[PDB]
Write an enzyme that holds these catalytic residues in place. Structure first.
Site, mmCIF file in Angstrom:
data_model
loop_
_atom_site.group_PDB
_atom_site.id
_atom_site.type_symbol
_atom_site.label_atom_id
_atom_site.label_comp_id
_atom_site.label_asym_id
_atom_site.label_seq_id
_atom_site.Cartn_x
_atom_site.Cartn_y
_atom_site.Cartn_z
ATOM 1 N N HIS A 47 8.378 20.203 44.166
ATOM 2 C CA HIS A 47 8.272 21.653 43.586
ATOM 3 C C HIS A 47 7.379 21.832 42.707
ATOM 4 O O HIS A 47 7.178 21.092 41.537
ATOM 5 C CB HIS A 47 9.580 22.269 43.346
ATOM 6 C CG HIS A 47 9.425 23.728 43.159
ATOM 7 N ND1 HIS A 47 9.204 24.733 44.197
ATOM 8 C CD2 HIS A 47 9.662 24.267 42.096
ATOM 9 C CE1 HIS A 47 9.011 25.707 43.366
ATOM 10 N NE2 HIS A 47 9.557 25.735 42.254
ATOM 11 N N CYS B 60 4.312 26.915 47.020
ATOM 12 C CA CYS B 60 4.501 27.000 45.588
ATOM 13 C C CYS B 60 3.412 26.519 44.803
ATOM 14 O O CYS B 60 3.339 26.970 43.556
ATOM 15 C CB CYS B 60 5.819 25.984 45.332
ATOM 16 S SG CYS B 60 5.571 24.402 45.622
#
Length: 148
Positions: free
Chosen positions: A140, A54
């Site tokens: 994230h 990510c």
């Protein structure tokens, strides 16, 4: 501060263990490029892309550099032991990898974390990007500012 054994054992690297900013001098924000590394010497082994990609997705969106080129660039600057290890396979890449990318692609990132914004990457740069980070878990990264 202590010397990490996998780093000193890493044959993709040479020389002494030093802070990233000593080995790769730029105008980094204070206390962001102090993490220990070694000079990367061996050419790329073409590591597979990380499963937890990510950070690459987020930087790619903001820079229009492909994730493959970002990852190959990381292999130009960091020893393999700092790219593929238990931490990156279970937690993903970190803001330390972002700092390395920021040197390699001359940008400064504003990371909008759960504790607020923070700067990563050299100031002696023209390009600016925005990255969102949530602690979760899991950690994230996403491109752009925190909306909603």
């Amino acid at each position: 501060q202590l010397l990490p054994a996998p780093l000193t054992n890493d044959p993709t690297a040479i020389g002494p263990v030093l802070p990233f900013e000593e080995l790769h001098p730029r105008r980094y924000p204070e206390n962001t490029a102090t993490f220990l590394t070694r000079l990367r010497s061996l050419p790329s082994n073409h590591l597979p892309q990380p499963t937890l990609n990510c950070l690459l997705s987020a930087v790619s969106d903001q820079t229009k550099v492909s994730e493959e080129h970002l990852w190959e660039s990381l292999q130009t600057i960091l020893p393999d032991s700092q790219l593929s290890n238990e931490e990156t396979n279970t937690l993903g890449l970190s803001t330390e990898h972002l700092t390395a990318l920021a040197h390699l692609y001359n940008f400064q990132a504003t990371v909008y974390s759960d504790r607020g914004p923070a700067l990563f990457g050299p100031s002696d740069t023209i390009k600016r990007i925005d990255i969102t980070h949530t602690t979760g878990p899991p950690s994230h990264f996403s491109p752009g500012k925190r909306l909603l």
